[PDB]
Write a protein that binds this DNA or RNA. Structure first.
Ligand SMILES: [Mn+2]
Ligand SMILES: [Mn+2]
Ligand SMILES: [Mn+2]
Length: 430
DNA sequence: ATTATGACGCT
DNA sequence: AGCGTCATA
């Protein structure tokens, strides 16, 4: 009754860029704008691997992970932009720098949690309270929410898409109680007003379009964001959760897209998020552990407490390269050459990081994969990182992996290496 | 032969 | 610590 927590204490948004690497390349090259377009890495093997796809290209069935040669079969006029290569490897600096542009704008509105290269969570609870105190109990005009969808509306007693959006927004606004500064639905609405402002600023100041979700926690905000991509934002209210979740595959919820989610489906014999409500918290804990069980019990009711962390910068800086098929490294000179290439890119990024962000990494993690191992990583070893010097770091990395060579001979490396990974970690203020 | 990342959980 | 899981361009 009066004591059941409803998880409506916060206003949380998730802002996610549309087709982000494609937009970065479209800004740079106007010829790519408003075209079926994709971003590819490498080229020699099957035309290269696609890692981002414009919405025009998606209409032809082009997806991420697709080889460009195969994408061209679906979409002959597909335009491509290639990821930069430096020191023999893909280099993602352009996209990291574009990300910083977006993150710095968002940070003007609230403290953000960088969740990927192209998205961040915002806790807007305080900003909403402030905007509410200025407003005076005026109704919120539809004109303040020009790109907002209200999930679940319209409903009850037009054949165009923008028409439907407005109908839902109208129903939503008319149901509001703007007289109550503690009403969660009102708080979400004001959150959505602020996010319109945020998204307008991002587009004005970078040229990049994005989508967003507004809800009471990170999982619902993330889910909401995807509902009306691209270039739109979606409000998912607490009240909208039972209908939304009644047909929502469990795998769609963040963190349930892998083995845990599959086990929820298999063990319980269910399909949709809403079906979880019929289990006790103890039942869920018995199957999925104490933490997962409590999390699922609350999550299927729309409730989650994971805070928006105040962290705008990545906490690791890493350099990685695969050596697939017959390109696997089989000599000492090869292994050392590539460790140096990775280490030189790492030095570059680390030095820039120290100057920009007043911090220094203190641990170097070295990871390799061996031919025959299905696992992402075969071996991970750490050592000290005391100087930002590529030759030292590459010499150190070789030392910690040296004993992995099962070859009797010194000159050969066996079994051949199919991945090298250098990562700088454990930052301290400097 | 999707690749290049990056956060967090477990023991 | 080293490994595993999950995630995103
Ligand atoms: Mn995106
Ligand atoms: Mn994203
Ligand atoms: Mn994506």
């Amino acid at each position: 009754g009066p004591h059941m927590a409803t998880g409506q204490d916060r206003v949380v948004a998730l802002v996610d860029m549309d087709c982000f690497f494609v937009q970065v390349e479209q800004r740079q090259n106007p010829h790519l704008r408003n075209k079926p377009c994709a971003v590819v890495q490498y080229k020699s093997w099957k035309g290269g691997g696609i890692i981002a796809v414009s919405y025009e290209a998606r209409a032809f069935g082009v997806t991420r992970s697709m080889w460009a040669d195969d994408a061209k079969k679906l979409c002959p006029d597909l335009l491509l932009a290639q990821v930069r290569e430096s020191r023999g490897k893909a280099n993602l600096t352009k996209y990291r720098e574009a990300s910083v542009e977006v993150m710095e704008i968002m940070s003007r509105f609230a403290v953000i949690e960088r969740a990927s290269i192209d998205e961040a969570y915002v806790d807007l609870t305080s900003a909403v309270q402030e905007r509410l105190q200025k407003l005076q109990g005026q109704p919120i005009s539809a004109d303040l929410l020009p790109s907002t969808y209200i999930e679940g509306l319209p409903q009850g007693p037009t054949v165009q898409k923008e028409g439907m959006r407005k109908q839902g927004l109208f129903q939503w606004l008319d149901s509001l109680q703007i007289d109550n500064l503690t009403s969660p639905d009102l708080q979400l609405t004001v959150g959505a007003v602020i996010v319109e402002e945020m998204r307008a600023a991002i587009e004005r100041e970078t040229g990049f379009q994005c989508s967003a979700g507004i809800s009471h926690n990170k999982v619902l905000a993330k889910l909401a964001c995807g509902l009306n991509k691209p270039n739109r934002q979606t409000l998912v209210s607490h009240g909208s959760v039972p209908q939304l979740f009644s047909q929502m595959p469990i795998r769609k919820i963040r963190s349930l897209g892998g083995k845990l989610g599959a086990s929820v489906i298999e063990i319980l014999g269910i399909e949709y998020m809403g079906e979880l409500t019929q289990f006790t918290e103890s039942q869920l804990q018995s199957h999925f552990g104490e933490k997962n069980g409590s999390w699922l019990y609350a999550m299927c009711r729309g409730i989650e407490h994971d805070p928006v962390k105040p962290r705008q910068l990545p906490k690791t800086i890493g350099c990685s390269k695969n050596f697939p098929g017959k390109t696997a490294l089989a000599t000492r000179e090869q292994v050392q050459w590539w460790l140096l290439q990775l280490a030189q890119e790492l030095e570059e990024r680390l030095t820039k990081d120290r100057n920009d962000n007043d911090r220094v990494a203190t641990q170097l993690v070295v990871s390799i994969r061996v031919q025959g191992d299905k696992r992402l990583s075969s071996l991970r070893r750490c050592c000290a990182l005391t100087r930002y010097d590529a030759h030292k770091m590459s010499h150190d990395a070789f030392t910690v992996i040296k004993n992995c060579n099962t070859s009797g001979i010194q000159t050969e490396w066996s079994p051949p290496l199919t991945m090298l990974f250098l990562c700088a970690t454990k930052f301290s203020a400097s």
